[PDB]
Each structure stands twice: as structure tokens, then as C-alpha cells.
Symmetry: D3
Subunit: 157 residues, 6 copies
């Protein structure tokens, strides 16, 4: 039984995220996408909206499921019988930040972290920049799943 948790805000999920989901699900028996609820910074979409968008985008991934996440990530992972985190990286600076989190998580709970490199096409894509561009009328449709873009237009009106 191999498996990993894929944590993030996914506010909203982008094609960069989806590519990582697919690639994780291709190699692990089970993937759990954890949608992290931050009571301090409530973004654009509610946690349930985010989960709904990820489920529509990952309909063809039967070994991937989506749940809301709260509290300490390594607790979330271990309570579900798993011992691994998986995440995508775009830049060296991403790696620096995530290496520090990864080493902390392994230190405090023995949970390991696996990274994959971004697909070239999505190296500049992020939820925050996509939202910003869309807010000022820019076309981010090629960067988001179809379901997401429609929902995004709805929020902006």
C-alpha cells in the first residue's frame, strides 16, 4: 500500500496543480489531495467550492480523493495511515522553501516528502497570478481547467 498526501490551498486549482495530481496518481496506489483551510486568509473560493472544482478536474483519477485539511499536516497524513507528502515545484526558490518544510516534517513526525518538477508549459502558473490577471480582464482560460474558468468568471461579477 503506497500512498501520499498532496497539500495546498488550490484557490483555485490550476492546470499546473492538475498535472501534478495526475503524475502522483500514476505512481502511488492512493493519493489524497488535502485542501488547506486557513482561517486567517480566506481566499476567493470556499473550501467546499475548491474541493468541488478539484473533483470535477480529477474525475478520471480513481485512486485520488479530495478532503479538507486543517491543523498539523503530518497529523493529517499519519491519521490516514500514510507517511508521505507529494508536491510540485516550479523554481529553485520553491525548492528552498519546501526543503525546509520537508526537513521539519520529517524531523517532527517521520513523514517524508516527494517533489516533482513542473511541466514546462505551466512554470509561470499560480492561483494568485491567475486570479490577479483575470480580475483585470486578462484571459487565463488556457491555464485553468474548463470548470474552473467558468466558476472564476462567476465570482468576478
Amino acid at each position: 500500500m503506497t500512498g501520499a498526501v498532496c497539500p495546498g490551498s488550490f484557490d483555485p486549482v490550476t492546470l499546473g496543480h492538475l498535472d501534478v495530481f495526475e503524475r502522483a496518481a500514476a505512481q502511488f496506489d492512493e493519493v489524497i489531495v488535502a485542501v488547506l483551510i486557513n482561517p486567517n486568509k480566506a481566499g476567493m473560493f470556499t473550501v467546499d467550492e475548491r474541493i468541488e472544482m478539484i473533483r470535477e478536474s480529477t474525475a478520471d483519477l480513481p485512486n485520488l480523493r479530495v478532503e479538507s485539511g486543517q491543523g498539523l499536516l503530518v497529523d493529517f497524513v499519519r491519521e490516514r495511515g500514510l507517511n508521505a507528502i507529494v508536491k510540485g515545484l516550479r523554481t529553485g526558490t520553491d525548492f528552498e522553501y519546501e526543503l525546509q518544510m520537508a526537513q521539519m516534517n520529517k524531523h517532527i513526525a517521520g513523514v517524508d516528502t516527494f517533489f516533482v518538477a513542473t511541466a514546462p508549459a505551466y512554470s509561470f502558473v499560480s492561483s494568485s497570478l491567475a486570479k490577479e490577471v483575470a480580475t483585470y480582464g486578462g484571459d487565463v482560460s488556457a491555464l485553468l481547467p474548463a470548470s474552473v474558468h467558468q466558476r472564476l468568471l462567476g465570482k468576478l461579477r
Copy 2:
């Protein structure tokens, strides 16, 4: 079912390598350590020596095996019915270099790459620096497995 190839020169294997082997073996059903040889440049250790040093320090990992090869890594991977590479990284610069290799490998063969962050204790450990230090009589005993240190001193004398 799940499986990954862990590639390198391993000339010689270090504790940093072994940590990554152990962590990969804990997460994939099988791991193949691929000792990749350039047939036109010998290292310090012969291929048989490299493999023996790895085997002697991985005896407790039942789902790990060690094989040598040359040429395209993605051919080594695919001929074994696998589709994943696993590698450790120490720095953001390592990430930039390995990201380019991973994106090339996925492009030409559809093979994916998973990275793990170095254990903190081994952030400064490399085969090349260990050999250089040992060449001038520095004590690298704590950085190498027992199967390696004295063999190394033997080469140097």
C-alpha cells in the same frame, strides 16, 4: 506494482545516497539502484566495486536491487517496465539542473522524476568532496558506510 529507479555514479556510495535509497524503498514497491557507467571515463571504483559497496550497506532493504547500465537513463527505466526516477537534492541549484533533466526525460520518454530533500546531516556530503578530502588525509569516516571507507583508503594508497 509501483517502482522507481535511483540513478547515479555512486563512486563511492555515501551515507547521503543510502538515506535516499532507504527513503525510496519505503515508498515504492521496488527500487532499482542504477549504477550508470560512462564507458570512456573510469572513476575511482570499478562497476563491480561500486555495486558491492551498495549491496553491503542495503542488505536490510528487501525491495531494493542494484544493477549497472549506460546510455539513456529512460531506456534503463522503460526496459524494466517502470516509469519513474527517484533522486535526492541538496540545493536549489541541484533542483535547477535536475529539473532540466527531468523535463527532458519526460519529453523524450514519458518517464517521470520524483525528488526528495537531503537529510540535514548530509547536506555537504558528495562522492567527489569525500574523495578529495580523503586524498589529502581528512577524516571522512562519518560520511561513508562501513562497506566504503577503508576500501577508499586502499585506493588512495
Copy 3:
């Protein structure tokens, strides 16, 4: 007719910015400095524009405008499709590469970068204001005009 937009907050413009303006102006027929209305800084947009105008008088082919909304819209609505910006660090490059690739994707607008002059490697609007606030001498890092205005803003 070649041209480029040089975007930033410029709060206030420093000698580092000015060096980039001069270097852009030397290579493009037309340069527009876009002062980004980002509505919480020290100077008003109009104050920033004036300070830039004062220190770029020797550059005949440069003008200064306030900017709001999508930068790529600002650029294209003025008939251009190049952005020019200075970089100090590889980290700056990473951040700016993402914006550059986004801007090219959504609008076909390209971005050209120049490396900082060695002398201005440590100069930023934020650090200059911070040091000046606690009484440090930043006169050698700002246009003579800007330096007087900064003193006034603090008193």
C-alpha cells in the same frame, strides 16, 4: 519605431531606477515610465511622477505616466509590446520570469531585463526609506531632488 514601458512603484525613484531608465532610453526610440497606482506608500502617484520627471530631464525620448489595471493593457493601448525592467539578483529574475512569461502568454508583450549597475546592488526604495527614517545618510543613493523631498516627508 521601437519602444518599451518601464513599470514600477518608484516610491521614491532611486539612482538604481534612474540608471535603468537611462539605459533603456539609449536603446529604444521611446520609453514610457509607468508609475503603478497600487491603492500604501510614502509618496502620492503625482509626487512620484514629478520626482521622476525632474531627474529624467536630460532624456528627450522618455515620458512618465501613472498606470492602473493590467500592465499589458497599458503597454498595448500605447502601441507598444515591450516591457523593460532592471534586476539585481537571481531571485529577482525568478520572480520576474514568471510575470514575463505570463504577460507574453496573455498578450504577446515581451520583457527585456538589464542587470543593475554594480554600485546600486544594495539600493531599493524600501531600504532607502527605512534607513532614512532612522536617521541614516542615503543622499548618495537618490537623485539630489528626490533626496530633499524625502527629508521633507519625514520632518
Copy 4:
């Protein structure tokens, strides 16, 4: 004669900080740990608490003392007749940021800065990440000196 100031928020002091204090004290005749306070943003610990935690874990360093301050660091340094700052770095990004600060400080006041590389064991340790992990109940006991860990748990409760 020789002396340096080691500046920071130390909110709270970690083992990574203490390692740098010890290493600085071994190389300069005197070291002053400067607890720098922003009078408009409180941290987790009061200045007196911060200083007490540092003192309790530096009792074996006879040439180290601890003082608080605010405003320009170079004024703190020069008013004590010193001309050097000493700081630890974990990453190349830390270096880029601290290089800009060091060059500014030498420009405005002629004060120089000396950097040391983190101990490998503490590469992932920061006050902020330790507080964040502890807030959600993660075990950070091995990352903080005895003078700190339980005081921290006390704040969080």
C-alpha cells in the same frame, strides 16, 4: 579588542542561533547579542523574556553579553565602539538578502558584516517555523534550548 554584534529578533532563540553565538564567541574577543525590538509590533515574547532565554543558554560563554535595542543596527554597533556584525546564513537566498543589508550598512556607517554557514543539523530551524509547528502541536523540543521549549508551550496555552 576585537568584537562583534549578533543581531536578531530571537523570538524565541533556537539551537541554530545558539550555535552561531557559540561560534562567534570563539572567534571574537567579545560578542554582544542584540535583541532588536520593533516598538510598533510585539512578538510572542517580551524583550525581558527573550533576553532571559538567551542568557540561560549562554551561561558558558564568558565573553558574550545580551542587550536590547531598536532603530539602526549600525548605531547600536558604533555606540559600543565596535565595527562588526556577525550573522548566520542557511541559504543562498539568505545570502542575497543579507548581502544587500551588509552593503547598505557598510555604506552608511563603515560597519562590516561577517557571516557563518548554518550547522547542517539546524538548516530547517527558524523561530517562525518552530512557533507555527508548536501552535498546531508538533514536537519542536529538539530544536530549542531548555530555557525556551516549555516557556513556548506556556505562551501557546
Copy 5:
């Protein structure tokens, strides 16, 4: 009359290089690609020049020359004082920043950088030759012309 020199070994030219050539040509009146005679590669300087010429036919304001000696001399002896180059990584930026600052110091020649297209982030002449040598398909990373020539060089 604006212009820039785009220097490199181009052994061989890739789609990553070509993208930069096209983007430079769109913003400067004149672009000169300088093929650096570095006298040990795969193609001769003349072969490299021809391959570049073949794939830049649609760019009226671009020409290709061999280059030797100081780049800043090459640039200034042709009446220009700008270099243009592409970057993939922050590490590229660090390396190139040092050359750029050196070149500005010794000769007053400026350097403009552009960010790689996302699609070509992993593309280099060296990696393309290496993969092709061991039998990998790099046809999507090279100009159609160049790709045929590379196959020939290996057989």
C-alpha cells in the same frame, strides 16, 4: 537606428535560441547573431552559421557572422553597443550578470536579457546532442533543417 548583437556558440542552434532571435529582431532595427569561434564542438563555425541562416530566413533584419576576440570589440566595431541574450534560470542570470557588468565597465556596452519561452526551459545544445547521441528523439526541440543535419553528423 537601434541594434543588438546576440552571441553564443549555437552548436547547434535550437528552437530556444531561435525564439530569442525572433524576439530580439522584433524590438531592435538590427540584430547580428555572433557565432563564437572558440577553438571543441560538433559543428564547424560555417556549418553553425548556415544552420542559423536557414532557420532565420523570415527575419529580414537579422544577419549572422562568425566572431572571435573580445565581444565588446565585435559589438563596437559594427557601430552597436548592446548585447542581447536569453536566460532560463536564476543561475544563468548570475553568470550573465557578471559578464554584463564586466562588458559595461570595459567598453560601455549594455546587455539586455529575455526570459526563455516556457516550452524551451529544458532545451540546450549540449543536452540535445547528448540525448540524440544515445538515440533519443529531439526533433521537437530543433529547427527541421538542423535536425536533419544532426542525424547526419551522428551517422
Copy 6:
């Protein structure tokens, strides 16, 4: 008795190096510049020529001396009763490389390493790029001490 060894090829010494020498000598009781002899890569200047150029450039630094260095650096340091290395850094990548060497040197011998950031004016200066530029007729006179530039012109004819 504070002190440090400043190691390098110094082939030839540049104003970037000299700035670091001056700043080290301003803070340590004793500085020893170690001119590293590499039997594999013999550069432009002999070790004795390099030592001579450094001595002329550091004539006003009475607590700095210059010696040839061979073999393991931490042995060189410790045999002279010192326990510290000092070096200058220009970029984050410099820091990455040197952090690894620094951690190795502290691991194998307990010798510490202190870094300073380059002066802004010399951030692009290196011996190798200076030699290359000068070789093809470029003016590197503002980047080198006077004595060095004269000697450099001599070698190029």
C-alpha cells in the same frame, strides 16, 4: 589571540581580494593569506609571483602575512594555531559552494569559516575573467592593484 586563514589561488590578486584582505585584517589580530598551489592546474603566475604581488598590495597591513599553501586546508590552519578560515562571497551560488566546503571543514577538523560580502564595485571581478579580458586587449586596470596590472601586461607579451 584571534585569527584566520584567507585561502585562494590569487592568480592574480584583484581589488576584490584586496578589499576582503583589508576587512579581515581590520577585525582579526592575525590574518594569513594562503596561496594555494595546484599541481594539476598551474595558472598564469607562479606561487612566488603571486605571493610577491599580494605582499606589495598589502604593505599597509602589518597583521597580515602571506604564505604558500599545500595539502589539506584545515591542516594548514591548525598547524599555525588558528581555527578559522575567512573568504569573500559575490553571489548566492558562491555561498552555496562555500557553505558545503565550510560544513565539510568544520565536520572534519572543527575549523570554522567566516564570510564577507563583496564590495559592490567588485562584484563582477574575478582573476579568470580579468585575465581573459586582458588577453584580448581589454582594459582591466581599474580592477587590479597597480603592481599587478604592470606584471600582467608583461606576461601577455
